[PDB]
């Protein structure tokens, strides 16, 4: 697509292998924000969106949070809190013709800056002067979309770059997009490490009496730690009790007297560790 009319595709209900994209040498720009690129296969994502367009070579700097320019302000705005990856690569052999490829256009003029992830395809005549256009071109009245002149002889920076922006939401809804890690069996009533949809932790998994609403995946306690979780394969609720922690106190006489010690496990029953309760 053009950048003013950037295409958005929903990615859902699939397993995404980002190791074949990040390790590919085809992409000249690969900038991830709010997530590490090597941690992508270990997370599960909800609401994955792929925005695709073609921009100029030196305008790839403007596809980032907090940038200013014609592309950021008038064509494609990213939020300051953006999480996702911006992937760009040179497409001079595909999107340039010898006379000039004019199929890619950008919005040069607008009355106000775009909101984040807002698309403007309106083609009203812009007023760059004092006299109103009344929808008709004239002095200081222009068509707002101008086309790139894409030729193969142009230097790098005036050459077309195909830009795909991936956008994720991190672990707040039930997730439909996951990396290729295989699932193991579900083990309950034991102190185990757990990885539920990219949510890592350590605890004991027990059957829960809580009834989650269908838009809810996990539950948080006072300290915003996940104390209840829904298993993504069999839709059941599990309490996550933290693995048993007990303060250890070393009862001793002086080392001048003896080296014998006793140990106290505070608030710990004797069957979960000269035994005295």
């Amino acid at each position: 697509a053009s950048v003013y009319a950037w295409n958005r595709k929903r990615i859902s209900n699939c397993v995404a292998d980002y190791s074949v994209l990040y390790n590919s040498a085809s992409f000249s720009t690969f900038k991830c924000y709010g997530v590490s690129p090597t941690k992508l296969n270990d997370l599960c994502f909800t609401n994955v969106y792929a925005d695709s367009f073609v921009i100029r070579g030196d305008e790839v700097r403007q596809i980032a949070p907090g940038q200013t320019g014609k592309i950021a302000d008038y064509n494609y705005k990213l939020p300051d809190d953006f999480t996702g990856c911006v992937i760009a690569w040179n497409s001079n052999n595909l999107d340039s013709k010898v006379g000039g490829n004019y199929n890619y256009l950008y919005r040069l003029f607008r009355k106000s800056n775009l909101k984040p992830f807002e698309r403007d395809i309106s083609t009203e005549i812009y007023q760059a002067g004092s006299t109103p256009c009344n929808g008709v071109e004239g002095f200081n009245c222009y068509f707002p979309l101008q086309s790139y002149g894409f030729q193969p002889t142009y230097g790098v920076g005036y050459q077309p770059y195909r830009v795909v922006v991936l956008s994720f939401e991190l672990l707040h809804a039930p997730a439909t997009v996951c990396g290729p890690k295989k699932s193991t069996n579900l083990v309950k009533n034991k102190c185990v490490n757990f990885n539920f949809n990219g949510l890592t932790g350590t605890g004991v998994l027990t059957e829960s009496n809580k009834k989650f609403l269908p838009f809810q995946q996990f539950g948080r306690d006072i300290a915003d730690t996940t104390d209840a979780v829904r298993d993504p394969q069999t839709l059941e609720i599990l309490d996550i009790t933290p693995c048993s922690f007990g303060g250890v106190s070393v009862i001793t006489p002086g080392t001048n007297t003896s080296n014998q010690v006793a140990v106290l496990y505070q608030d710990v029953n004797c069957t979960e560790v000269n035994v005295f309760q």
Partner: peptide, 16 residues
């Protein structure tokens, strides 16, 4: 009095 305009992509506009 403005008569018309030729764009770089071949787009023409005129005085109506």
């Amino acid at each position: 009095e403005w008569i018309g305009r030729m764009y770089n992509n071949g787009r023409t506009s005129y005085n109506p």
